[PDB]
mmCIF file of C-alpha atoms in Angstrom:
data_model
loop_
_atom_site.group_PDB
_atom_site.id
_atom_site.type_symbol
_atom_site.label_atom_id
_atom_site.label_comp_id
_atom_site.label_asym_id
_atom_site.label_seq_id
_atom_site.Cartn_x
_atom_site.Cartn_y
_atom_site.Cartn_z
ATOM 1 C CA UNK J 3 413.287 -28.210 -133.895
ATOM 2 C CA UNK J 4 416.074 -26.177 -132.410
ATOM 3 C CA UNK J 5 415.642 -23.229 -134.425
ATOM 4 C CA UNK J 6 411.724 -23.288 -133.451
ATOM 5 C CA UNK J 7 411.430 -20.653 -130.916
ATOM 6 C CA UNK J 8 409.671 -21.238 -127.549
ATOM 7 C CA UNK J 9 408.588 -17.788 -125.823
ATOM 8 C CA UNK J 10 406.004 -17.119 -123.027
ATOM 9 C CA UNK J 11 403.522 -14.057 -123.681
ATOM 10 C CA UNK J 12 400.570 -12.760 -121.654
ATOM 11 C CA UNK J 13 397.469 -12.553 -123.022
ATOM 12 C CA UNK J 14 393.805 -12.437 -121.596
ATOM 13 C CA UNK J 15 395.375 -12.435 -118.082
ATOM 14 C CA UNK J 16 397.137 -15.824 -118.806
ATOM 15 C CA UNK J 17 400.793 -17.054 -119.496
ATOM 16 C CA UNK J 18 400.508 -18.831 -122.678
ATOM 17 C CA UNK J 19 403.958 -20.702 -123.967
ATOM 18 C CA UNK J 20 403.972 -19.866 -127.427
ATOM 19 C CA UNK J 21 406.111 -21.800 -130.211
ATOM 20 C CA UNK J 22 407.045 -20.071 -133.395
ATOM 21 C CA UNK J 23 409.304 -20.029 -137.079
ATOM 22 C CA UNK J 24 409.338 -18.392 -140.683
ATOM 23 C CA UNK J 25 408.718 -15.140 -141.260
ATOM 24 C CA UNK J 26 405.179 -13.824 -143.742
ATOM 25 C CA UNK J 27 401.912 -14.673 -143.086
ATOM 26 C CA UNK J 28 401.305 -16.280 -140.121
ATOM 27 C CA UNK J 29 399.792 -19.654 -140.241
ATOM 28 C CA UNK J 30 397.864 -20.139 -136.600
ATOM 29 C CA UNK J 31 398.083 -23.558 -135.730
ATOM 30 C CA UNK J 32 395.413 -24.928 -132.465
ATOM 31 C CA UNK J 33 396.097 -28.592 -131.152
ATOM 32 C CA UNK J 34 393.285 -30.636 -129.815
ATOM 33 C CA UNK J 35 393.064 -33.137 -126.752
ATOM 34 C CA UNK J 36 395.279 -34.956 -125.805
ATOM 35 C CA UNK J 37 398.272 -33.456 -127.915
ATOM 36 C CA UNK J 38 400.198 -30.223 -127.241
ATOM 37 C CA UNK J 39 401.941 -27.700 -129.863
ATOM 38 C CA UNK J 40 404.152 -30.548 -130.505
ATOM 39 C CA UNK J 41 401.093 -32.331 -132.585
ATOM 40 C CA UNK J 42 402.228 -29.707 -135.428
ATOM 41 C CA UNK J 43 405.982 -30.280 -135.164
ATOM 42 C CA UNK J 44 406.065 -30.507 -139.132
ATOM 43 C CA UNK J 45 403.647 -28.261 -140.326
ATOM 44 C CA UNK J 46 405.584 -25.652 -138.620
ATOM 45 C CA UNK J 47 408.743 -26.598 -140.379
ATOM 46 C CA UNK J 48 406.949 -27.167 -143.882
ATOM 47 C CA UNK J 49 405.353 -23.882 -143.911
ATOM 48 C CA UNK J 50 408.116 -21.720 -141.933
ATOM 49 C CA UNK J 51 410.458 -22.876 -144.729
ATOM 50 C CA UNK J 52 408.174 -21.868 -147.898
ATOM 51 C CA UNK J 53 407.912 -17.818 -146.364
ATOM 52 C CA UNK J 54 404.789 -18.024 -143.897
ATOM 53 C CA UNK J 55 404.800 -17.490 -140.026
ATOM 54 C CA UNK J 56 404.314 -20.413 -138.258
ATOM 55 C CA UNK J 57 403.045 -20.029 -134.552
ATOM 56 C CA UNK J 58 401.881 -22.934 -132.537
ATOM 57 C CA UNK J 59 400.410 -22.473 -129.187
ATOM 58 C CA UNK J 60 399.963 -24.392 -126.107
ATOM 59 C CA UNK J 61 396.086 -24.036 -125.574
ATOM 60 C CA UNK J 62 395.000 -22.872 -121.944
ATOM 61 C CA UNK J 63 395.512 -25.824 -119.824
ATOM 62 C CA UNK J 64 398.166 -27.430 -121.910
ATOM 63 C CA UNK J 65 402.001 -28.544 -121.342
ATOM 64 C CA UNK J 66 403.626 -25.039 -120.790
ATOM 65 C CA UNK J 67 400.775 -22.871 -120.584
ATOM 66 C CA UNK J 68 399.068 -21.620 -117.748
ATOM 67 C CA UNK J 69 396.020 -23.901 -116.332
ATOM 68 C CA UNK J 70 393.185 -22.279 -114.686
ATOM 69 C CA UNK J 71 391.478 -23.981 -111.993
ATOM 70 C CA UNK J 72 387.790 -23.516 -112.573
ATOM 71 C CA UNK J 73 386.168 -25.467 -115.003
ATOM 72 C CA UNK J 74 384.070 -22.179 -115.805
ATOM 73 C CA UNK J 75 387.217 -20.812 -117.355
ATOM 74 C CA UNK J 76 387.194 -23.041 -119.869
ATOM 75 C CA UNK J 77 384.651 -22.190 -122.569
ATOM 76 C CA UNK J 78 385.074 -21.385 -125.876
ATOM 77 C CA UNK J 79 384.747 -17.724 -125.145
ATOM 78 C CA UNK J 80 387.740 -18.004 -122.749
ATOM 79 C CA UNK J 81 389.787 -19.814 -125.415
ATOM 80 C CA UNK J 82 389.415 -17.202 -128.458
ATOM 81 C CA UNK J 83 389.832 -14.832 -125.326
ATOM 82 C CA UNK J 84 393.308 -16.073 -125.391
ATOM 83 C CA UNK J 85 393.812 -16.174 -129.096
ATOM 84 C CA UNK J 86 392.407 -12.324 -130.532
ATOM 85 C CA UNK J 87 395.083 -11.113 -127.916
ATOM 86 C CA UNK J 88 398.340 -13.988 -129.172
ATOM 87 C CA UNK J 89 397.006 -12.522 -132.811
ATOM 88 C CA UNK J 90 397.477 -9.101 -131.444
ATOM 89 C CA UNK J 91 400.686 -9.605 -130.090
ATOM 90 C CA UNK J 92 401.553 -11.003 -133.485
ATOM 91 C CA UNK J 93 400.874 -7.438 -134.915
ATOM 92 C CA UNK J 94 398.408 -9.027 -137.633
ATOM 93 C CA UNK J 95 394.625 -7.973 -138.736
ATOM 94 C CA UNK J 96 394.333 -11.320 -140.235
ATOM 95 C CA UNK J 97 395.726 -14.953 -140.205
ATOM 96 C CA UNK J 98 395.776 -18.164 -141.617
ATOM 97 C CA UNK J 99 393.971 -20.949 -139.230
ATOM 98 C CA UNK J 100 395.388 -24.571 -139.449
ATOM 99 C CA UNK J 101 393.428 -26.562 -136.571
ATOM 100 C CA UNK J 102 392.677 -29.945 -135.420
ATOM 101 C CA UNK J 103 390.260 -31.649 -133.017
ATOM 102 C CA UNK J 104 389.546 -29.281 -130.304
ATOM 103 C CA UNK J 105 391.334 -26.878 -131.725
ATOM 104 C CA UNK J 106 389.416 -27.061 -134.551
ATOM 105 C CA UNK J 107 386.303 -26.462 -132.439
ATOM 106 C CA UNK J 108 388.497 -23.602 -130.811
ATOM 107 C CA UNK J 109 388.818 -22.138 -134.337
ATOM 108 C CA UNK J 110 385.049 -22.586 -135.728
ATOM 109 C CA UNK J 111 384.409 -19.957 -132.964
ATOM 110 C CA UNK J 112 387.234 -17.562 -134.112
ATOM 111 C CA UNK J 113 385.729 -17.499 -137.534
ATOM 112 C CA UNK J 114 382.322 -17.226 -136.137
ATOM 113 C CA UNK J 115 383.050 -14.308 -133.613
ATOM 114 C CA UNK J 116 386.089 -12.799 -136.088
ATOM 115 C CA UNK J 117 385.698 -13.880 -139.693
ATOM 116 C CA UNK J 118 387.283 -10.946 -140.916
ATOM 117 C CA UNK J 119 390.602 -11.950 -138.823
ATOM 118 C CA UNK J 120 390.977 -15.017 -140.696
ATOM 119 C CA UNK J 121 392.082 -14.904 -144.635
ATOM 120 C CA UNK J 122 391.061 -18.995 -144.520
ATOM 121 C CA UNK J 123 390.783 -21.884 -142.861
ATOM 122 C CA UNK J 124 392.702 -25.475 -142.964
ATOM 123 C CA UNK J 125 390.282 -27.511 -140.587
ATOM 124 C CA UNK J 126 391.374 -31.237 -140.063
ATOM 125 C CA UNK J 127 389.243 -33.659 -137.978
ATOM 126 C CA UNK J 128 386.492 -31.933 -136.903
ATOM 127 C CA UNK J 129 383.755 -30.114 -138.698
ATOM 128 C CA UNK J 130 381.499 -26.827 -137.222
ATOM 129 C CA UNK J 131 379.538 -27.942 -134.637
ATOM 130 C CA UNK J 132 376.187 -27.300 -136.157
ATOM 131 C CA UNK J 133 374.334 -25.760 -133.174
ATOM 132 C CA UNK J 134 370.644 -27.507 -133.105
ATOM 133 C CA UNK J 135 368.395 -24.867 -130.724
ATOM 134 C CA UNK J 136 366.414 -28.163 -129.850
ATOM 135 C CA UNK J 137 368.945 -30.280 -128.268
ATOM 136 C CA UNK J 138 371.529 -29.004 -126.407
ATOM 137 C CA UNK J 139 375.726 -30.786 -127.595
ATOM 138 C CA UNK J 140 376.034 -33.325 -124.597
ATOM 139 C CA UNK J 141 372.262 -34.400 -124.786
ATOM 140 C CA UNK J 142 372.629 -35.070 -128.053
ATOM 141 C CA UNK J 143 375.488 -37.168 -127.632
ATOM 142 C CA UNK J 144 374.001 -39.403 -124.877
ATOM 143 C CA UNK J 145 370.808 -39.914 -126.762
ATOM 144 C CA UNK J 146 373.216 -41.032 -129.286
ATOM 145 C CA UNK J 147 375.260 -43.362 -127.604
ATOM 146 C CA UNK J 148 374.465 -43.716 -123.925
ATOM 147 C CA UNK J 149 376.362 -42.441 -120.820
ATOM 148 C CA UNK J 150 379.462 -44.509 -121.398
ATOM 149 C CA UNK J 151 380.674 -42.578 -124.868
ATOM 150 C CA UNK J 152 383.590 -41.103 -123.686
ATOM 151 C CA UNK J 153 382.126 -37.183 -124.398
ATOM 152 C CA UNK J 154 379.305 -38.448 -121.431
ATOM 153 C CA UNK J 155 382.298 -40.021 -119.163
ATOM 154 C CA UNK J 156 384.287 -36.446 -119.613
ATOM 155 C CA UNK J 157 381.747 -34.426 -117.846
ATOM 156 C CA UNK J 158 382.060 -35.377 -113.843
ATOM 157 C CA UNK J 159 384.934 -33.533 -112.175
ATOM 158 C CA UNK J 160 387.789 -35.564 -111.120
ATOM 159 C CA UNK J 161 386.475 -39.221 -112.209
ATOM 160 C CA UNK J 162 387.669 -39.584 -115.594
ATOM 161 C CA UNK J 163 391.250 -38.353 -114.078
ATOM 162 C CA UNK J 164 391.184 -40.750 -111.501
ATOM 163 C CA UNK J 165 390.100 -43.565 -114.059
ATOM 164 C CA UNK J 166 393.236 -42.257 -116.076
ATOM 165 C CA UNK J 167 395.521 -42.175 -113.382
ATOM 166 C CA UNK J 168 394.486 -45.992 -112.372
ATOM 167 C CA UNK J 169 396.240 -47.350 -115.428
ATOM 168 C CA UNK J 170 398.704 -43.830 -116.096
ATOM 169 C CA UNK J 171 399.380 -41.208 -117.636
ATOM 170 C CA UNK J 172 401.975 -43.186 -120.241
ATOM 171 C CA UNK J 173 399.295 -45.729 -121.319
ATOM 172 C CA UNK J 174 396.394 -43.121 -121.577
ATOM 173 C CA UNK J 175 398.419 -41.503 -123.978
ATOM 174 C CA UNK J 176 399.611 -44.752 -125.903
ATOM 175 C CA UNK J 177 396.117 -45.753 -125.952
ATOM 176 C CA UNK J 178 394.436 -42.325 -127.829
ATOM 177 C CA UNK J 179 397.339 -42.115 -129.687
ATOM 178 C CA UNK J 180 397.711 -45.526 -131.515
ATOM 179 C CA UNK J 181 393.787 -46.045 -132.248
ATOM 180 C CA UNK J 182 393.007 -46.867 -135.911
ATOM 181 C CA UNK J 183 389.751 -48.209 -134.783
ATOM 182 C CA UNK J 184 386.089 -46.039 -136.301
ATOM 183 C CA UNK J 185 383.576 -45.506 -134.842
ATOM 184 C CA UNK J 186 381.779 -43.513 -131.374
ATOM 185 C CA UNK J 187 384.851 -44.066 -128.416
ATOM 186 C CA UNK J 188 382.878 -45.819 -125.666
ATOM 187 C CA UNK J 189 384.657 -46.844 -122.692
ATOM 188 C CA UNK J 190 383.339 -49.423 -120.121
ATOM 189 C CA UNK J 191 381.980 -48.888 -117.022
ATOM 190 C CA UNK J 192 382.994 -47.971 -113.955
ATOM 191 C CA UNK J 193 386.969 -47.950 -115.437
ATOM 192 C CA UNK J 194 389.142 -46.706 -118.253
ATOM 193 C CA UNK J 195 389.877 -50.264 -118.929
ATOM 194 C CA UNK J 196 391.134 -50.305 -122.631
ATOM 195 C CA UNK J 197 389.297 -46.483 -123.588
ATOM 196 C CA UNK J 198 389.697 -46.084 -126.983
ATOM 197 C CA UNK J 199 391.670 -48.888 -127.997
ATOM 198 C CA UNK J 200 391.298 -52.539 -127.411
ATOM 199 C CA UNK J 201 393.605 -53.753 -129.637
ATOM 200 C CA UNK J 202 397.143 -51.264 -128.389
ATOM 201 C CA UNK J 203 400.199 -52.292 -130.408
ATOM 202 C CA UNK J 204 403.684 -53.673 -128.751
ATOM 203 C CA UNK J 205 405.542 -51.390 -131.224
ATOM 204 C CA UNK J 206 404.332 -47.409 -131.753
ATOM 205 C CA UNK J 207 403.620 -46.915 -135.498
ATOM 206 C CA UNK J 208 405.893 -45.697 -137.656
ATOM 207 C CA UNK J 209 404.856 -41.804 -137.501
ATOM 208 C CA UNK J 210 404.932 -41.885 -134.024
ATOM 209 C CA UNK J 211 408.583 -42.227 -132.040
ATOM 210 C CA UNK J 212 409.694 -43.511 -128.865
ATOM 211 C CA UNK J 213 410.798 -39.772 -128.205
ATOM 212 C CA UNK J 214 407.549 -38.012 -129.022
ATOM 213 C CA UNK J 215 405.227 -40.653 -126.754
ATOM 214 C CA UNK J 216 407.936 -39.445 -124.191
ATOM 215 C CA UNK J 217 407.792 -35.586 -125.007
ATOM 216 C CA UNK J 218 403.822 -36.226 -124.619
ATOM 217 C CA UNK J 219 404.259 -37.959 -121.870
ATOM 218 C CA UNK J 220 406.782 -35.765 -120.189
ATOM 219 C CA UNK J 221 404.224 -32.815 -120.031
ATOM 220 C CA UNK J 222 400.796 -34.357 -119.477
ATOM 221 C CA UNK J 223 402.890 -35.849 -116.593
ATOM 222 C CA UNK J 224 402.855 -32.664 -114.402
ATOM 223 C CA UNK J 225 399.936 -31.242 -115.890
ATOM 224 C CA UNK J 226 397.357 -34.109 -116.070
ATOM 225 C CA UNK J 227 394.797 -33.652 -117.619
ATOM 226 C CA UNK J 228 392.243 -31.988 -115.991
ATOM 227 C CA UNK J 229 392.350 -29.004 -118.057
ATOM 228 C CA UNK J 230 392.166 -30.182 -120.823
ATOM 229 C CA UNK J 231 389.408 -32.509 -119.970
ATOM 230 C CA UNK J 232 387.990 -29.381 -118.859
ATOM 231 C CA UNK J 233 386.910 -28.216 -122.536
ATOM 232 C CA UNK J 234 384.252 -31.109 -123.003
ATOM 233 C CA UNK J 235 383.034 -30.014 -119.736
ATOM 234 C CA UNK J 236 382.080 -26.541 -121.117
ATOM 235 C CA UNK J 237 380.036 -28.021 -124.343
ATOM 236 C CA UNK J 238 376.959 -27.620 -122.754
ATOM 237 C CA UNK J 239 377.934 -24.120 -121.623
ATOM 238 C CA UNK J 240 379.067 -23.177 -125.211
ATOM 239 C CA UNK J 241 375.548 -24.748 -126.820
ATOM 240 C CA UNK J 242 373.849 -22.061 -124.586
ATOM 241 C CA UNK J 243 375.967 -18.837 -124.945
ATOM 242 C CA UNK J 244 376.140 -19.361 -128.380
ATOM 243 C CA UNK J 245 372.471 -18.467 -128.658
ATOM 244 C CA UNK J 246 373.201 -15.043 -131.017
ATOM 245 C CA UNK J 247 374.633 -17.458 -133.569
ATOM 246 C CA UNK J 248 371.940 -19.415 -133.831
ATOM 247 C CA UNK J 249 371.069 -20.775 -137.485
ATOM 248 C CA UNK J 250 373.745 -18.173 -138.745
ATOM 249 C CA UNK J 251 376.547 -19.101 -141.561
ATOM 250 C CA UNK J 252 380.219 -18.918 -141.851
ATOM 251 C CA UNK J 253 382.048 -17.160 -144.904
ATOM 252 C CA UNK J 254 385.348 -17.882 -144.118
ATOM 253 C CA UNK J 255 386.972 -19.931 -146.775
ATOM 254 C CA UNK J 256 387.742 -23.310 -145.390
ATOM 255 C CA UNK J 257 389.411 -26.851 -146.586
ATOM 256 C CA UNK J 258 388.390 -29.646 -144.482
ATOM 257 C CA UNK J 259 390.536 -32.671 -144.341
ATOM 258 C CA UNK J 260 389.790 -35.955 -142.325
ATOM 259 C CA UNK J 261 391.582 -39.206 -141.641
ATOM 260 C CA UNK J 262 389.219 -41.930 -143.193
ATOM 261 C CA UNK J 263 389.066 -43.862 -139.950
ATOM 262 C CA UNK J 264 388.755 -41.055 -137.893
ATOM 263 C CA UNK J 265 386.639 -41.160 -134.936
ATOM 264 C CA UNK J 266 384.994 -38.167 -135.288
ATOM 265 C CA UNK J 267 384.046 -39.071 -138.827
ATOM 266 C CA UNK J 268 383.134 -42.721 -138.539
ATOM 267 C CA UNK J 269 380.040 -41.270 -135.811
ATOM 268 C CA UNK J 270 378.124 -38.445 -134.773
ATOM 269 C CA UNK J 271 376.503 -38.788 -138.235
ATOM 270 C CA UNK J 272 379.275 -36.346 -139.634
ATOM 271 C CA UNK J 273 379.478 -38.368 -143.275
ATOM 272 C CA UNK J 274 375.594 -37.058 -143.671
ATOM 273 C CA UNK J 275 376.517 -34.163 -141.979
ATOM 274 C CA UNK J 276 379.717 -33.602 -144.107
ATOM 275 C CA UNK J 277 379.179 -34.665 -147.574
ATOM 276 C CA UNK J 278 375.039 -34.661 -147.028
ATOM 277 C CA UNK J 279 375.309 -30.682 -147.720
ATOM 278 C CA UNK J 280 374.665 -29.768 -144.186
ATOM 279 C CA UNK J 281 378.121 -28.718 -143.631
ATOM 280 C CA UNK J 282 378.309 -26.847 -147.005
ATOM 281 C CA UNK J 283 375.050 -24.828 -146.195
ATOM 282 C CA UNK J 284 376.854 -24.032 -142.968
ATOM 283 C CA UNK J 285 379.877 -22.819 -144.474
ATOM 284 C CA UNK J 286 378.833 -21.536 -147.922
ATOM 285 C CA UNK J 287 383.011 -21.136 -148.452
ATOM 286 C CA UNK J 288 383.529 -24.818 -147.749
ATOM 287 C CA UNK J 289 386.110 -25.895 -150.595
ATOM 288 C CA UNK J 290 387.614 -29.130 -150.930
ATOM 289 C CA UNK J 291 386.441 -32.341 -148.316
ATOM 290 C CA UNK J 292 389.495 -34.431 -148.454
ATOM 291 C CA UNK J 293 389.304 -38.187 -146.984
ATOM 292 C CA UNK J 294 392.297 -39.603 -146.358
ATOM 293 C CA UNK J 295 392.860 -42.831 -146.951
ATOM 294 C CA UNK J 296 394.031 -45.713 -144.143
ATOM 295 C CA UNK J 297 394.212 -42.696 -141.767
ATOM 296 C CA UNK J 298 392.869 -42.386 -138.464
ATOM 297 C CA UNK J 299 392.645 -39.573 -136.291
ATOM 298 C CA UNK J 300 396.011 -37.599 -135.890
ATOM 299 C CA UNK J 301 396.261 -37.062 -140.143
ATOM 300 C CA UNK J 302 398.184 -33.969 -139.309
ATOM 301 C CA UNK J 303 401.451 -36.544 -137.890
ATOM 302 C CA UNK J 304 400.527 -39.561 -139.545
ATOM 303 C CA UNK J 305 400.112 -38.060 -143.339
ATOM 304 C CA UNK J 306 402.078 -35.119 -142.612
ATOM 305 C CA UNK J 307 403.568 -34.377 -146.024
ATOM 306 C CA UNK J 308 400.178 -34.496 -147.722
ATOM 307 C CA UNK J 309 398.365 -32.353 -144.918
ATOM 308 C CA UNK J 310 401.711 -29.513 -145.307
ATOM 309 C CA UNK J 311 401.092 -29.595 -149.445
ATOM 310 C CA UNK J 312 397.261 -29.289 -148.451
ATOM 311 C CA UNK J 313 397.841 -26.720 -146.479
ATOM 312 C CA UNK J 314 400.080 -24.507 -148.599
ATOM 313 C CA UNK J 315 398.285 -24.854 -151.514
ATOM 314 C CA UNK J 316 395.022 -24.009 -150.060
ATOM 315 C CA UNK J 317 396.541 -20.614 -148.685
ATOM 316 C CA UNK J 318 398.550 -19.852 -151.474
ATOM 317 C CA UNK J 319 395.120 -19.029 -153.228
ATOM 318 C CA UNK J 320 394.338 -15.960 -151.247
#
């Protein structure tokens, strides 16, 4: 941890705080919502010490990096914005992409816009987005599961932070981060109320400690979390600029892993989707589907010495 190095570059017209270690290739590692660099804390010592680069950004809007104040500047476009130019600063053509959650949506649009930049993809939690040109992202959601599905209670500015900041930023966190229960998150009206856990633990489980809920905490704590929130609130916006890439495929070679009680896999009808050959039609490249089992949604923490052997032995192939 203190030989992980923690610099601040510029790129896209942003200051991005950028964490790396190793020297080689360089594995690109994106964090999702509502984590931080810190989500990949062992993946970047597992790979760093077997002769790849490990670099872990804070995403735009995150802990230490820079967080616009327009929701507009949050699109996808905006994100891989920020990313061609990190990967430029790197002095690579290509990379390897490791990715989870949002930042696996973050890197579905890297390899969509700049396939040949990435040699291939470890993609845990969330699949590509398949974009349907008869239903816009949201809409399909809420036809799905009603306005109260957390994706639907994301959208409003300033309500789902103020919701947040009724029971704090401490249990918020607690709450995401010690769900093990599957299926669509939907929160109840008018509050956060439990969110996305009803049944929260005294004690953190055991790949979680005391220090990193505090670490988490300690940063969403003076950032809040409007800009991250602020990514779901561009999914609309994405559907519709993503128009030139409609019905198009992905070659990038990629190994999806999931946590087998996974939100994101236990609704959205992502098992069809996944295993169905949807996704493989999508992403002709698609290699292994791993399923973890007893997991839940942060694999990459709590299976981390299976998801750093996945990872390396995936790459080591190209």
């Amino acid at each position: 941890m203190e030989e992980i190095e923690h610099r601040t570059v510029e790129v896209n017209g942003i200051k991005m705080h950028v964490a790396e270690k190793g020297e080689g290739p360089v594995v690109l590692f994106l964090h999702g919502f509502p984590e931080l660099w810190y989500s990949w804390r062992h993946q970047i010592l597992a790979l760093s010490s077997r002769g790849y680069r490990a670099v872990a950004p804070d995403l735009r809007g995150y802990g230490d990096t820079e967080a616009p104040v327009s929701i507009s500047s949050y699109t996808g476009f905006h994100i891989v914005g920020d990313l061609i130019a990190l990967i430029d600063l790197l002095g690579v053509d290509q990379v390897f992409l490791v990715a989870h959650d949002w930042g696996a949506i973050i890197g579905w649009y890297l390899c969509t816009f700049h396939p040949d930049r990435v040699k291939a993809y470890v993609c845990l939690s969330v699949p590509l987005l398949h974009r349907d040109p008869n239903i816009r992202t949201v809409d399909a959601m809420r036809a799905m599961y009603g306005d109260d599905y957390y994706i639907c209670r994301f959208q409003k500015p300033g309500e789902m932070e103020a919701q947040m900041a009724e029971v704090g930023t401490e249990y918020v966190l607690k709450n995401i981060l010690t769900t093990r229960k599957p299926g669509p998150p939907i929160f109840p009206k008018g509050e956060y109320g439990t969110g996305f856990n009803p049944d929260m633990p005294n004690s953190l489980p055991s790949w979680l400690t005391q220090d990193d809920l505090a670490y988490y905490v300690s940063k969403y704590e003076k950032t809040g979390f409007t800009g991250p929130l602020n990514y779901y609130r561009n999914m609309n916006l994405n559907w519709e600029l993503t128009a030139p890439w409609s019905g198009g495929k992905i070659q990038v070679p990629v190994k999806f892993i999931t946590g087998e009680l996974d939100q994101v896999y236990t609704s959205l009808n992502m098992k069809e989707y996944i295993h169905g050959g949807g996704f493989k039609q999508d992403v002709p490249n698609l290699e292994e589907v791993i399923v973890q089992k007893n997991v839940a949604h942060f694999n990459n923490q709590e299976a981390a010495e299976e998801i750093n052997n996945h990872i390396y032995d995936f790459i080591k192939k190209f």
